[PDB]
Amino acid sequence: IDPMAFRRALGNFATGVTIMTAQTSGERVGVTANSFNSVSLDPALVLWSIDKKSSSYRIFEEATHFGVNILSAAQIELSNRFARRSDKFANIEFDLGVGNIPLFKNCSAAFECERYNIVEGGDHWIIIGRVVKFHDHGRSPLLYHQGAYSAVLPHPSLNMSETAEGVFPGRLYDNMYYLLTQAVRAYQNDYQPKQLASGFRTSEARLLLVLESKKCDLQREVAMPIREIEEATKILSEKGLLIDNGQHYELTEQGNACAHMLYKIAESHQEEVFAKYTVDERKLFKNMLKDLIGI
Amino acid sequence: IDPMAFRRALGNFATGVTIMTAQTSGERVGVTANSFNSVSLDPALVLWSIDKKSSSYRIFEEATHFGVNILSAAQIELSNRFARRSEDKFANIEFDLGVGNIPLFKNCSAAFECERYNIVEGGDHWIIIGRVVKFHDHGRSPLLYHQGAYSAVLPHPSLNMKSETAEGVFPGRLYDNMYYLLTQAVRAYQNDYQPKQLASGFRTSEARLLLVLESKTASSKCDLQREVAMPIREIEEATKILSEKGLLIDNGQHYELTEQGNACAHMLYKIAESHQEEVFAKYTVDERKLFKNMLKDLIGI
């Protein structure tokens, strides 16, 4: 099967973002990884897949301990730093655990592991580690879905019911916070099928909407790692929507049209339901939304 | 180390929801699993961990193929059905057959038809590695599982709150749309509510139960599972923790919150209302009333 088409199919499985750290001596490594997952509770075992050609596996193989840093939603810069080969720990504060495990700050969780055993896994090494100490902080996590960073949309869905007061799960869910998250649910249920029908994934749409206006700068605006940007710009170039002459990325006439239609789709739901309101009422709704954001 | 405290710490790593299916004959199994993850591209290898006490591993060990069904956000009922041991999980459940008679569900985000590659020991679980021979890429909005509760994906990249120009706040000039303003409003609200809820020592599973049980008592776990969007296993886990804190009473008929539990549910309500009441205080009562009615129009209630 095609490796690229398979990697893009794996993007449907949303995961968190972890950073695997280890230190021997003074040799230190930091690898951003999303192949992490749990295995067993007794004993406490976790695994993750590291590339066989990664220049960091030698230090993971030499060190007796490695750490799993569950990144929070406010650690996108920390994810991109430990995502490209480099002194990755330059100007990066961290603490040391058992086995000199580099532990970062403001993380959602951390798992200090002893190296349990390594297993063959195709073109990767499956590193199994025994958790000897963990940290449960509970901060809002960072997501990685379809090659783009996202966040978790909280609150359970509402019963779409019998009574007007029975729509909410409880009587206390009639709050502004719950109404905002459920408005995004109803909006996402209307926009996502329309974007998918046009053959655009999340990585493709974010680049069309950004490049239509005006690699590190682009990485910080679309919230996508460099590896996913290079992958998506290639796909957009195959569809005749982008030209990568070597200097920068520019959308074609065909690319600018697709970016504007994605704007029409993201506005079709609000324009369809707010048609009964006046122009001043719709303008007030945006001004009150900006007051919630802070702009 | 404590297994329970360790399992709760594992909830910080948000994952999607998959259902592992296999069929031999007519012997059929379906296990909801979030331990799934990718391994290798060449060859295409994926793994997941199945419990050693699972009554379905024997059929997974016998069958030559098993499937990974990536569930979508509208498949919470399908996740809970295949989340409890039953003799006929596929009753009144439509599905198709792939290679090796792999049961494939409909309306999923993605699917991975795999041949049984190798099984590896993994503590109290079996690590099943499978080689992907066929996949389906649909791209639907996925179902999330974080801190023992079902959730959805909050899209769109964050906006630049520290820029010079007013039009430079958005990543592009086309991001000034109502969809983006709604998602970024939830970001600003979550950044204000989430740190305050954590300061009270309540996770997602605890907060959803406090806000639901405060209104009415919950008799059957099947109904409570459908309202808080949490599997039965997490409800029994969280109601115990709320009971340790003196916030819940399980008399045997129905879950009931204590007066201390009712207090914690009200304080979570004030925190969820503090941000809007603080920024919308300049608006009139009719303007704030219109904002809720226009939000309900977006939802459909």
Ligand SMILES: Cc1cc2nc3c(=O)[nH]c(=O)nc-3n(C[C@H](O)[C@H](O)[C@H](O)COP(=O)(O)O)c2cc1C
């Ligand atoms: C979101 C994300 C997930 C990643 N997951 C893995 C992974 O599971 N295994 C791996 O070897 N590299 C993964 N990488 C790439 C690592 O950052 C990798 O260490 C990087 O290419 C550095 O290469 P080096 O270790 O050879 O120096 C991931 C990168 C990103 C952005």
Ligand SMILES: Cc1cc2nc3c(=O)[nH]c(=O)nc-3n(C[C@H](O)[C@H](O)[C@H](O)COP(=O)(O)O)c2cc1C
């Ligand atoms: C969100 C979620 C994720 C789960 N992940 C796994 C898993 O990765 N491995 C596993 O063996 N069971 C997992 N389970 C338990 C399954 O629901 C499993 O089907 C259940 O224990 C019954 O299995 P049985 O039919 O083999 O007895 C998970 C349950 C839920 C709710």
